[PDB]
Amino acid sequence: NPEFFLYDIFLKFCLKYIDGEICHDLFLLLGKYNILPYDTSNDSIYACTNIKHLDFINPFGVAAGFDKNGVCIDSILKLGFSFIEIGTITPRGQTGNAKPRIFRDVESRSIINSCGFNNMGCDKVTENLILFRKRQEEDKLLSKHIVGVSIGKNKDTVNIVDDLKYCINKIGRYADYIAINVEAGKLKNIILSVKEEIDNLEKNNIMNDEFLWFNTTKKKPLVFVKLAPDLNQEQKKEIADVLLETNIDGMIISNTTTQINDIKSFENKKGGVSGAKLKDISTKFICEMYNYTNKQIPIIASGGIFSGLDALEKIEAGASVCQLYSCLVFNGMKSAVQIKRELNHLLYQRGYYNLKEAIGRK
Template identity: 40%
Template sequence: MALRLKLRLIRTFVITTSGLIVYTIADKFYEPVLKPALQLLDPETAHDLAIFAAKHGLVPKDKGKDWSGLSCEVWGRQFQNPIGLAAGFDKHGECVDAMLSTGFGFVEVGSVTPEPQDGNPKPRIFRLEKDRAVINRCGFNSVGSFLVSERLRKRLSDVRKAQPGVVGVNLGKNRDTQDAKLDYEKGVVAFADIADYLVINVSSPNTPNLRNLQQKNQLVDLLEHVIAVRDATLKERSPNGRPPILVKISPDLSDEELKDIVDACMQLSIDGIVISNTTVQRPPDLLEKKVAEEKGGLSGPPLNKISNALIQKVYKMTDGRLVIVGVGGVSSAEDAYDKIRAGASLIELYTALAYEGPGLVRKIKLGLSELLQRDGFQSVQEAVGKDVILSTVPYGMRN
C-alpha cells in the first residue's frame, strides 16, 4: 500500500506541476527533476503520463525557426524538417498536433490494428538505463482503427487547431487474425483518405508469425492486395492524391531475406521502406545484462549501428531509388546525420525522448543544420547516401 500511495503522489505531482514546468524552464527542469520523477514509475505508466501531458498541451512548443535547408520534399509532400516521431509513441492518435508543435516535421501514428486489442500481458516495457535503451513486448496494443481514424478526421476538420506537418499511419494486424491481408485491407480502407502515408508493419517481433510476412511470396501477395485496395478505396472517395505505401522491416534479416524484400518493393513500385523495427538481438556490449534477458524488441542506441548497416545495404541495392526512412537509436544530431549519409531521406526517433525529453528535437535540428552546412550541403537531400558507393550495374539488369 505504501508503494501504491507513493506512486499516486508522484503521479499527482507530475500532472499538477508539469504545465508550469514546461512553460517556464521546460528542458532545464526535465533532466534534474521531472525525469527522475517519471523514472520512479514503471515505464508504461510513465509513457501514459507523457501522452496525458501532450494531450493537455503540457509539452514545450518549438518556437524556433528551422534552417531552410532542413525542408525537403518526399512523395510530393513538403516536410518542414526530416525529423519525425516514430510509431509506438502515439499509438492511438491522441496527441498528433502536440508532438508536431514540439518541432517534429512529421508524426507516425500507430501501430493501429483493425479491432481493439489489449496486447501482451504487463509488464511489457523495460528500461535499460545504463544503455539508454528499452525492451518492449507490447504486442500491438490498440484501441482499433475506428477510434483512431475518428480522432484523425476530427483534427483535420478543425484547421485552426491542426498543426502543420505530415502525419502517417502505421498499420498492424490483430493477433488472432488468420488472413493477414484482410486486416491490412481494413486498415487501408480506414486511413487511405486521411493519412499522408501508410506503413505496412510486418516486422514487430511481438506478434506471433508476423515476421513471416516478410518472406517474398507472402510479401508480394500482401502488397499487391494493399495497393489494389488503396486505389479502389480512393477511386470511390475521389480524394486529392494517393497516400504512399511503405513497408517497415526487421533489423534481424539475413542478406538473402533483405534482397527478397527489396526485390518485392521494387517489383511493385512501393514508395518507401522504414528501416528498422526493434531487434531481438542482444549486442554483447550491453551493460544491463539482467534486463537484457527480457523477451521483446530492443530499441535505442544499441540498435543504431544495426539499422545503419541495413540502410546502407538497401540504398546501395536500389541505387538510391527507394525512399528510406531511417529509425533506430537516434539520440543526437550526429546519429541523424549518419543515417542520412547512409541513405535515409527521413529520420524517426522515439526511445531517446524518454531519456532526453522533448527538447531533444530542437537540439537535433540545430545540430543537423550545423553538420550539413559544415560539410558544404545546402539541403538534406544533397547529403542523402553520401557515404555509400552505388553499384554501376542498373538494378533491373542484376541477376
C-alpha cells in the same frame, strides 16, 4: 527554454522512479490537454526534405508505437517534429501482452519491449485522427505537418491482406502515408493489395480530391514498408527485389532487434530492443537496402538516433528522413529542438549546401 527545462527535470525524475509505460501514458495525457511546450521556431529551408511528392518541413518525426492510438498528435508535433507515425493499429482493439512489458536501461540508453500490438482498434483511432484533422484546419502550428498511419494484422487473423484492407478503407482518407508493419512472395501480395485498396478509395468517391483526402497532402497516401533488422543477406536481397517490383514509395529502416544480449538489466527479458544499442545495426541495414534497391527507394531511418551526428550518419547512408523514439525517453522534450540545431551546424561544418545533398554520400 524554461518550459522545456522544467519539464525535462520532471522527466528525468520520472525516468528514475516510475515505470516506463506509466510515464509514457502520463506525458501523452499532458500532451492531450495541451500543457506541453511548443517549438515555434522556423525550420531551416536547407534541412527540408521529401519522399517523392511528400514534403517534410524538417527531417525529424516520431516513430510508430509512441502514440499508438493518436491521442496526442497535436502536442507531439508541436514539440518541433515535422511528422508522426501513429499506430501500429489493428482492425480490432487488442490488449497486448501482460504488464509490465516495457523496460529501460538509462546507462545504455536502450529500451526493450513486448507490448504485443496493444491499441484501441481502427475504429477508435480513425475517429481520433479525424478530430486531429479538424483541429489542424484551425491550428497555425500544425500546417504542413504530416501524419502517417502504421497498420498491422490482428494477433489471430484469418487473412492479413483483408486486415490491412479494413484499416485502409477506414483511415486511409485521413493519412498522408500508410506504413505496412508485418516471405518475399507473400510480401509482394500484401504490398500490391494495399496499393490497390488505396487506389479504390479514389475510384469509389465522387468528390474531387480536395474534398476526398482529408489529410495534409490532399493526395492519396503513400505506401511505406517497415523492415525488421533480423534478416539474413538473402532475405534482404529477396525483399529488395519485391520492393522494386511493387514500386513501393519508401521503406522504414528499421524496427527493434532481438540480437542484443550485452545489456544486463534485460538479461531475463523478452522482446525487441531499441535505442543506442540498435544504432549501428540499423545504420548498416540502411546501406545494404540502399545498395540492393539501387537507390530507387527512399528510406525513413529508425534506430538509435539521439544527436545531429547520429542523424547525418543515417542520411549519408541513404535515409531521407529520420524517426525518433528512444531519444524522447532519455533526452526529453527538447529532443526535436536540440537535434535540428545539431544537424544544421553539422551540415554547415561538412560543407553541404542542403540536407538533400548529403543523402547517400557514403
